């Protein structure tokens, strides 16, 4: 039933297949909802979605800066169509700092964790996080253990130096009388990409997020 067609493919040049263009696309890395836990907390990683993970697992070592764009949307409940122009606070917490536990925790005024204050009805917030790893490049794969303790023996393949930090987003505005749900979309665009040691592509379904186990099909 399929029509067997063809075309005279006329093309030249290799600038499109550059690694800077291969992995340099802004991809959605997380999407979460919270109805006014009570705030958005998520550790930054590129393995959340299978497509981006498969693309990134084509190399062993990758070094890049991170560009983050936060796109918030609000939907009301029960009665006008007037969405409040709330103020949002997105704070980046590095690995060596504690993360907030509640909406009004003390860490929201850290003065060392960078924070962005932006409004709902404004252009989406955007900030660039540099290459913060302790090593020269991130390890897409790690054949080893964090330490010698029996606790670390259950953490095969986890290198503590590969964590990228936490992004905590909250609504600074107090509880409004109305009921609303906030949806947060995080877009990550790597910059200044450098990649080393290409690897065979993944051909089998993933069974977990941190072990590279495989199952049927």
């Amino acid at each position: 039933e399929a029509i067997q067609t063809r075309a005279v493919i006329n093309q030249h040049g290799t600038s499109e297949t550059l690694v800077e263009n291969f992995l340099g696309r802004a991809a959605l890395v997380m999407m979460k909802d919270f109805e006014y836990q009570n705030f958005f907390k998520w550790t930054i990683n590129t393995r959340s979605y299978v497509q981006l993970r498969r693309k990134f697992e084509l190399f062993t070592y990758i070094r890049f800066d991170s560009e983050i764009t936060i796109v918030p949307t609000i939907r009301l409940y029960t009665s006008y169509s007037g969405l409040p122009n709330l103020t949002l606070q997105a704070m980046f917490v590095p690995v060596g700092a504690p993360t907030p536990k509640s909406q009004d925790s003390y860490e929201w005024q850290s003065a060392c964790n960078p924070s962005v204050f932006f409004k709902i009805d404004d252009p989406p917030a955007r900030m660039t996080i540099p290459f913060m790893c302790i090593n020269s490049a991130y390890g897409m794969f790690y054949d080893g253990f964090a330490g010698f303790e029996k606790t670390a023996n259950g953490l095969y393949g986890i290198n503590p130096a590969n964590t990228m930090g936490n992004l905590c987003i909250r609504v600074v505005n107090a509880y409004q009388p109305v009921q609303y749900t906030i949806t947060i979309r995080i877009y990550l665009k790597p910059k200044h990409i450098k990649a080393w040691v290409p690897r065979p592509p993944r051909t089998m379904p993933y069974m977990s997020i941190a072990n590279t186990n495989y199952t049927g099909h």
């Binding site: 063809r6 005279v8 493919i9 006329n10 093309q11 030249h12």
Partner: protein, 235 residues
């Protein structure tokens, strides 16, 4: 009286061979800088570069016109047909020659127009033309509504296409040279046509004591045939 000789075929003409090059371009070849990015074509300068004389058609007083689609008209004729059936990629020009045989007591005018990418249409229906309607081979088609060129345009404005006039009191021959007319360097001969040679009788053929029928002869010669290589070594 001169002759148009191409390969092993020759046509005797009435010295009216004022050739009309379509858009002022001679068919030359695929340029070198356009061939690096695509498959490399060879140049079969074989018997493909000869005139193919189709069967003569009858011009009557009620004729609406005839059209031939290229390279569909030559897809099953001679060495060109063989090369078309064995190669999947082709690129060639054409040199159409139209001749008429009439006495000094005949009258009529033919508009020999080469229409590129002539997408044939239908009349009072939404369904597109079927395969048999378009691909007519060497027999050729017959215009149903020559006033609209069978496509909703106007024959009056068809003069913008590469054309020649055959007025029986002035001349009886037309010669249009067609270059490569496509948006791609090469194309597929079996299911796409580049030119449509149309012969529309603008002024009806008339006479009082004549034969009431004159023959029209169409001769088409591919000019710069190029096909994909079928014998590149794989070592």
């Amino acid at each position: 009286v001169l002759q148009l000789k191409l390969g092993n075929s020759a046509i005797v003409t009435q010295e009216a061979a004022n050739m009309c090059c379509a858009y002022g371009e001679w068919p030359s070849y695929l340029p070198d800088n356009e061939a690096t990015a695509i498959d490399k074509p060879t140049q079969p300068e074989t018997s493909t570069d000869r005139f193919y004389t189709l069967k003569s058609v009858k011009w009557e007083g009620t004729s609406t016109g005839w059209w031939w689609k290229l390279p569909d008209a030559l897809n099953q004729t001679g060495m060109f047909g063989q090369n078309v059936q064995y190669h999947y990629l082709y690129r060639s020009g054409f040199l159409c020659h139209v001749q008429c045989n009439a006495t000094k007591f005949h009258q009529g005018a033919l508009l020999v127009v080469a229409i590129p990418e002539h997408q044939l249409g239908k009349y009072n229906t939404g369904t597109s033309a079927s395969f048999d309607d378009v691909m007519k081979g060497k027999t050729g088609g017959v215009f149903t509504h020559p006033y609209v060129l069978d496509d909703g345009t106007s024959l009056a404005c068809s003069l913008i296409f590469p054309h020649q006039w055959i007025n029986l009191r002035t001349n009886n021959s037309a010669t249009i040279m067609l270059p490569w007319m496509n948006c791609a360097p090469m194309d597929f001969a079996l299911r796409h046509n580049q030119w449509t040679l149309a012969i529309i009788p603008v002024v009806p053929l008339n006479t009082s004591g004549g034969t009431t029928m004159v023959p029209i002869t169409v001769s088409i010669a591919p000019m710069c045939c190029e096909f994909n290589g079928l014998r590149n070594a794989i070592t």
